[PDB]
Amino acid sequence: SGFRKMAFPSGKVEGCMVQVTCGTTTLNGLWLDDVVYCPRHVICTSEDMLNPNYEDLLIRKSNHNFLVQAGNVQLRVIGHSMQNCVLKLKVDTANPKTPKYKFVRIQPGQTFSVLACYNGSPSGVYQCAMRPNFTIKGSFLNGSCGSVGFNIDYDCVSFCYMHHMELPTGVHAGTDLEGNFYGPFVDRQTAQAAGTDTTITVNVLAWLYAAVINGDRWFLNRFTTTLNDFNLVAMKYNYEPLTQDHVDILGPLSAQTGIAVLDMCASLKELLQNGMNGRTILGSALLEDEFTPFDVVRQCS
Amino acid sequence: SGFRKMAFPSGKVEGCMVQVTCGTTTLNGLWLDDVVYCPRHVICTSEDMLNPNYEDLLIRKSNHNFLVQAGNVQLRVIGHSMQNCVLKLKVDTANPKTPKYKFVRIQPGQTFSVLACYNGSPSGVYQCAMRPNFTIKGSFLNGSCGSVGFNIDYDCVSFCYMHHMELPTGVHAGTDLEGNFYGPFVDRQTAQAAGTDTTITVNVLAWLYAAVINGDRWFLNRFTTTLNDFNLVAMKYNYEPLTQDHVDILGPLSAQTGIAVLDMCASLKELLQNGMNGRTILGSALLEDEFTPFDVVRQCS
Ligand SMILES: *[C@H](S)C(=O)c1cccc(C(=O)N[C@@H](Cc2ccccc2)C(=O)OC)c1
Ligand SMILES: *[C@H](S)C(=O)c1cccc(C(=O)N[C@@H](Cc2ccccc2)C(=O)OC)c1
């Protein structure tokens, strides 16, 4: 019993984190096989961040300008190249702790674990969701860029995020491991801002199923709704539309609890229109949208 | 920026988890140096749980009755003994991955990370607080006992909790690593239940300081209160009394934000008496009490 925001065990990732320094900028990197991946912003100067041409900045660097430290061991850089907004530093030692891994780009509404690191040293692990507006609500301080996000399946680490920056509202933006940004953000100084966001409906329904599995039933009712009538309500409250694929994905949890998906949608409509009237669900007084159907099944089996 | 429930990186702990089997009962154990620690309930049968005499049950066992598996490698048990409610299995191999460690008993109101495991395999990591009533609000399924809780300082793992059971309200009980239970709970079948709980006031104030550090200020006011008048309000709302030691511990966060502790207590009094009026703090619509002053300082530096 119980339901917590649970991250994947981080050991496999911890054995990949290193420190990368170029001039006076120090950040984190990810060491897999004989390559270290890190944000290309490591090569910038403070006065470069105004429309830096990164191809020019990199051509002016050599291998010896990159100091890579893994624990207390310096790794010799023997090649460098850029891929989109990430730097690839070839080193002369393959990481003996490389896990099986994949680089996978995630979708908005999917969750992942973040290993926050400073100076190549892991500090904390937590779960995050990619928001519909392609930001994440992380916890990151100066020095955390290059920290990565990941999911683990069997023994395979699927890396999905590399941290780059903080936007003015305090939310975070970064790229995939191929160096392509999530969202309409860039690694330079502009007035860029998070766009409007929405609530991830299918995840809210998944979490209501978690609550039922864990004994919270007060919000249930005998009603059902149609998908169309539900989505009229969703649109009014800035919730994403619910698709038949979403309904299908909720199939297992509906079968486990015996509560039809459209039946649970009637409960969600009531909660949106009426609020909670002083009650809580799974220890929250708000509707939670950062757990996917998979997250619920994994934790509530 | 940002504020998340953050756990410690779990790799050091992961390298200590093993599977312990006795007869048909399988659970997790913690392998440090040449000893494996696990709940003594592993030696019980289903019909033993009615007032089992564990000294009799253990005398009837031999080393070969314990199967310890670390990954895919069986460890030979060469001695067994009981310490309070934990079993100590001496094995013929020292764990090469033993971290520096300590066994430390925590107090109610302190937090720790839990590495939930099944069949000696880590599944997830999350943060928990020891409640005033000595339970924890975990997330644990059948097979998770022997999973441990811990804090990490520098390179030293301080183990503080070993999971044993779930109480009827869905909250969890266990022991320290010396096998002594937290709270008035026992490892046998009874009608035992969690006692009345309270809210951890000093942690709520720590979290209000985190919110201010992160830009949430709407709950601030120009008022102050005395400690006595505040504690009259705390008692009414089932909050723990605030001591001068608590005030002292909040000293750094008060200095960082410029908000006196008693000043913040006036805000908390207003929130308790008036509620939130539709607003949120750090993404919550309830007052959060599972972050200690130390947790805030570590994450909000
Ligand atoms: C480090 S988390 C990183 O990868 C990164 C990516 C994009 C932008 C920034 C960043 O902080 N830029 C600042 C300017 C700067 C910082 C450090 C060295 C040189 C220049 C900035 O002004 O935006 C916040 C970091
Ligand atoms: C496993 S998490 C463990 O250590 C433990 C400690 C105390 C009590 C129990 C427990 O589940 N007892 C049940 C009976 C039982 C289970 C398994 C084998 C033998 C007997 C019980 O009835 O209480 C929930 C487990």
Swiss-Prot record, chains A, B:
Changing Q189A: Does not affect ability to cleave and inactivate human TRMT1. Changing L205V: In strain: Zeta/P.2. Inhibited by pyridone-containing alpha-ketoamides compounds 13a and 13b. In turn, alpha-ketoamide 13b (tert-butyl (1-((S)-1-(((S)-4-(benzylamino)-3,4-dioxo-1-((S)-2-oxopyrrolidin-3-yl)butan-2-yl)amino)-3-cyclopropyl-1-oxopropan-2-yl)-2-oxo-1,2-dihydropyridin-3-yl)carbamate) inhibits SARS-CoV-2 replication in human lung cells. Inhibited ex vivo by michael acceptor inhibitor N3. Inhibited ex vivo by compound 11a and 11b. There is a cross-link at K5, K90 (Glycyl lysine isopeptide (Lys-Gly) (interchain with G-Cter in ubiquitin)). Residues 1-301 form the Peptidase C30 domain. It catalyses: TSAVLQ-|-SGFRK-NH2 and SGVTFQ-|-GKFKK the two peptides corresponding to the two self-cleavage sites of the SARS 3C-like proteinase are the two most reactive peptide substrates. The enzyme exhibits a strong preference for substrates containing Gln at P1 position and Leu at P2 position. Residues 1-301 are cytoplasmic. The active site is at H41, C145. It is found in: Host cytoplasm; Host Golgi apparatus; Host nucleus. Cleaves the C-terminus of replicase polyprotein at 11 sites. Recognizes substrates containing the core sequence [ILMVF]-Q-|-[SGACN]. Cleaves and inactivates human TRMT1, preventing tRNA guanine(26)-dimethylation of tRNAs. May cleave human NLRP1 in lung epithelial cells, thereby activating the NLRP1 inflammasome pathway. May cleave human GSDMD, triggering alternative GSDME-mediated epithelial cell death upon activation of the NLRP1 inflammasome, which may enhance the release interleukins 1B, 6, 16 and 18. Also able to bind an ADP-ribose-1''-phosphate (ADRP). 3CL-PRO exists as monomer and homodimer. Only the homodimer shows catalytic activity. Interacts with host FBXO22; this interaction promotes the proteasomal degradation of nsp5. This is 3C-like proteinase nsp5. The chain holds residues 3264 to 3564 of 4405 of the full protein.
